Write a protein that binds this ligand. Structure first.
Ligand SMILES: C[C@]12CCC(=O)C[C@@H]1CC[C@@H]1[C@@H]2CC[C@]2(C)[C@@H](O)CC[C@@H]12
Length: 250
C-alpha cells in the first residue's frame, strides 16, 4: 500500500529560496530586515503554489483559500525555517536562507533577538523530539489550517472538514510504527504541543513586522508589494483579535 498522502506532500515541498542579501557588506539593521522582507515576498510565491497543490485545498471557497494563506504564512514560514535550521546547521544558527544565516550577533542586530532565540528553541525541538521528515511535512500542512476569523470563513464547514482530514493523516503517520495506543497518544500530545508553540512566536513576529512597516520610512527598511499589503490588511486583523489561532491545548 503506497502512502499517497505523504507522496504528495513530499512532491510539492518547495525547493531552496534565496534572500538576495549582500553578505559582503557589514551587517546593518536596515539591510538585514530589508532582506528578510524580500525573502518573505519570495517565499510567499512558493507558499501559495504549495498550498494550492495540497490535497483537498481546492475544495475551499476561493476567498477562503487566499485568506488562510494570508493569515497562516508567518507560522508556516517560521516552522519551515526552524526545520531548515535543524537539518542544515543542527540549529546552531537560524537558516532563513542559504544566503541569510543568522548567528547571535545578527539576531541582536535585527532587533528581534528574543524572537530569534525562541525560533532557535523551536529548531532544537525538531532534534529533541526526533521529529521525522514525514511528521514535519504533515505538521506544516496543518499549520495552514490553524488560524481563522472569529466571524467565520465563507464556507467554514469545508474548512473544518479539510482540517479534520489532515489531523486524521497525522494520526496515521503516528500509528505507522506504533502498535501501542498509549505511545500514539503520547506522540500526538508532543506534536500538538509543538504546533501550539508556533503560534505565540508568530504573534510576536506579527507585532514586530506591523510596527516596523508603520515606521519603515524612518528606519530605511524596504517592504515589497505583497508583504506591505498583507501586513497592513491581514496582519492587523490578527493583532486586533478578529482572527485567532486554533490551539489544541489551553
Ligand atoms: C517570514 C520570514 C521570512 C521567511 C523565513 O524563513 C522566516 C522569517 C521569520 C521572520 C520574518 C521573515 C519575513 C519578514 C519579516 C516579517 C520582518 O518584517 C520581521 C519578521 C520577518
Amino acid at each position: 500500500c503506497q502512502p499517497i498522502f505523504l507522496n504528495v506532500l513530499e512532491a510539492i515541498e518547495p525547493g531552496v529560496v534565496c534572500a538576495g542579501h549582500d553578505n559582503n557588506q557589514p551587517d546593518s539593521f536596515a539591510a538585514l530586515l530589508s532582506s528578510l522582507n524580500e525573502l518573505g515576498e519570495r517565499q510567499l510565491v512558493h507558499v501559495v503554489k504549495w498550498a494550492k497543490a495540497l490535497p483537498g485545498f481546492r475544495n475551499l471557497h476561493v476567498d477562503d483559500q487566499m485568506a488562510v494563506i494570508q493569515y497562516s504564512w508567518m507560522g508556516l514560514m517560521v516552522f519551515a525555517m526552524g526545520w531548515r535550521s535543524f537539518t542544515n546547521v543542527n540549529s546552531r544558527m537560524l537558516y532563513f536562507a542559504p544566503d541569510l544565516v543568522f548567528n547571535e550577533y545578527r539576531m541582536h542586530k535585527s532587533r528581534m533577538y528574543s524572537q530569534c532565540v525562541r525560533m532557535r528553541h523551536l529548531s532544537q525541538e525538531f532534534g529533541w523530539l526526533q521529529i521525522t521528515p514525514q511528521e514535519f511535512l504533515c505538521m506544516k500542512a496543518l499549520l495552514l489550517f490553524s488560524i481563522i476569523p472569529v466571524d467565520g470563513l465563507k464556507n467554514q464547514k469545508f474548512f473544518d472538514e479539510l482540517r479534520m482530514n489532515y489531523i486524521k493523516e497525522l494520526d496515521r503517520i503516528i500509528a505507522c510504527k506504533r502498535k501501542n495506543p498509549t505511545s500514539c497518544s503520547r506522540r500526538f500530545y508532543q506534536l500538538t504541543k509543538l504546533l501550539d508553540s508556533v503560534q505565540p512566536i508568530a504573534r510576536e513576529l506579527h507585532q514586530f513586522t506591523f510596527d516596523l512597516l508603520i515606521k519603515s520610512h524612518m528606519v530605511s527598511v524596504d517592504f515589497p508589494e505583497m508583504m506591505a499589503e498583507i501586513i497592513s490588511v491581514q496582519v492587523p486583523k490578527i493583532l486586533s483579535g478578529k482572527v485567532k489561532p486554533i490551539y489544541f491545548h489551553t
